[PDB]
Design an enzyme around this catalytic site. Structure first.
Site, PDB file in Angstrom:
ATOM      1  N   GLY A 109       0.809  -1.216   0.000  1.00 33.79           N
ATOM      2  CA  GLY A 109       0.000   0.000   0.000  1.00 33.79           C
ATOM      3  C   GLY A 109       0.840   1.263   0.000  1.00 33.79           C
ATOM      4  N   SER A 110       0.458   2.231   0.811  1.00 29.59           N
ATOM      5  CA  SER A 110       1.115   3.544   0.763  1.00 29.59           C
ATOM      6  C   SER A 110       2.507   3.551   1.372  1.00 29.59           C
ATOM      7  CB  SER A 110       0.252   4.578   1.449  1.00 29.59           C
ATOM      8  OG  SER A 110      -1.026   4.630   0.807  1.00 29.59           O
TER       9      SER A 110
END
Length: 325
Positions: free
Chosen positions: A60-61
């Site tokens: 993800g981020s």
């Protein structure tokens, strides 16, 4: 001569299991590293398998600091550029943030976790280039920890990528790695541009690693990451009294029944301190929180804060600013 520090291991394990209980989560994992040597100081899981090494997750981020670093390193952007961060689509796929930010500089992209901003920086590189970059971070490269059930992770061949894929990889879809592989990548930011191998043994001298970024790039990116834990950032819950903390939050939709779920998530918080001259990396992941929030910051931030503050204390590292707590 194991690198494990029993006091840190106990702290990690206790704080992890308490957060998992409080958020009524399914499971969680914590990795604590020496930021300068790659020695693994703690590795803790909720009861069951050794998820820190066995379980492939989407970063993800938590991949974004590397995309931003690479763009600054290659001179594709700078600290002055304000990027248009309006959302858009390619066919059925949106590329969008949590809010509509008309524009952000690279600091803002980090601070607010802009998927749009990250995608645009990534798009300044060719597909094959980005593939080799993810491979150089260690994605798809087995750790050879010694533990059974360990896989290399997943990095799809660049020749297969559709137009949208490079974009969505830049905010962490489609790549898979273990929490240990992800924590390892952060050594390139903490050890001044040099990725470290990681070790379960005490090291008298930092191993030779591999340069990924210029020292100057790593230094600027660490300072940008302090914005995540300061007011305005997604990760204020991970701030530690007496220290500046560089961190990144992640919240990943779980892929369930050939479908990314709208309300089932993996919460991640990864950070290091002291931000200017880091000595410790703490990486926390909480799977399927169902009470008291689901985002990386709110769920994995508080255990990060306790594990980081406690680790700094155990290791005898002096606060860099006056205490207030």
């Amino acid at each position: 001569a194991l690198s494990l520090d029993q006091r840190i291991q106990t702290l990690a394990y206790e704080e992890l299991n308490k957060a998992v209980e409080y958020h009524q989560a399914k499971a969680g994992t914590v990795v604590v590293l020496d930021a300068r040597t790659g020695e693994i100081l703690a590795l803790a899981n909720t009861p069951g398998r050794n998820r820190a090494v066995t379980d492939m997750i989407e970063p993800g981020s938590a991949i974004k600091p590397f995309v931003i670093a690479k763009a600054l390193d290659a001179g594709k952007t700078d600290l002055n550029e304000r990027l248009n961060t309006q959302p858009y689509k390619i066919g059925p796929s949106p590329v969008r943030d949590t809010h509509v930010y008309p524009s952000l500089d690279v600091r803002g992209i980090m601070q607010k976790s802009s998927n749009v901003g990250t995608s645009k920086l990534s798009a300044r590189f060719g597909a094959e280039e980005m593939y080799d970059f993810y491979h150089e971070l260690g994605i798809g490269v087995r750790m050879h920890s010694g533990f059974p059930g360990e896989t290399a992770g997943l990095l799809r061949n660049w020749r297969r990528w559709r137009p949208i894929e490079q974009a969505t990889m830049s905010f962490g879809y489609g790549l898979q790695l273990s929490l240990l592989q992800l924590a390892r990548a952060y050594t390139a930011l903490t050890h001044d541009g040099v990725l470290l191998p990681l070790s379960f043994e005490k090291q008298a001298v930092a191993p030779q690693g591999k340069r990924i970024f210029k020292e100057s790039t790593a230094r600027e990116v660490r300072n940008l990451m302090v914005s995540v834990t300061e007011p305005g950032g997604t990760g204020t819950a991970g701030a530690v009294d007496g220290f500046d903390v560089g961190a990144k939050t992640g919240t990943a939709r779980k892929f369930v029944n050939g479908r990314y779920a709208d309300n089932k998530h993996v919460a991640t918080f990864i950070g290091f301190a002291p931000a200017k001259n880091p000595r410790v990396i703490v990486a926390v992941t909480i799977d399927e929180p169902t009470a008291h929030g689901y985002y990386g910051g709110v769920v994995a931030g508080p255990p990060f804060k306790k594990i980081m503050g406690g680790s700094l204390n155990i290791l005898g590292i002096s606060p860099t600013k006056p205490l207030t707590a």
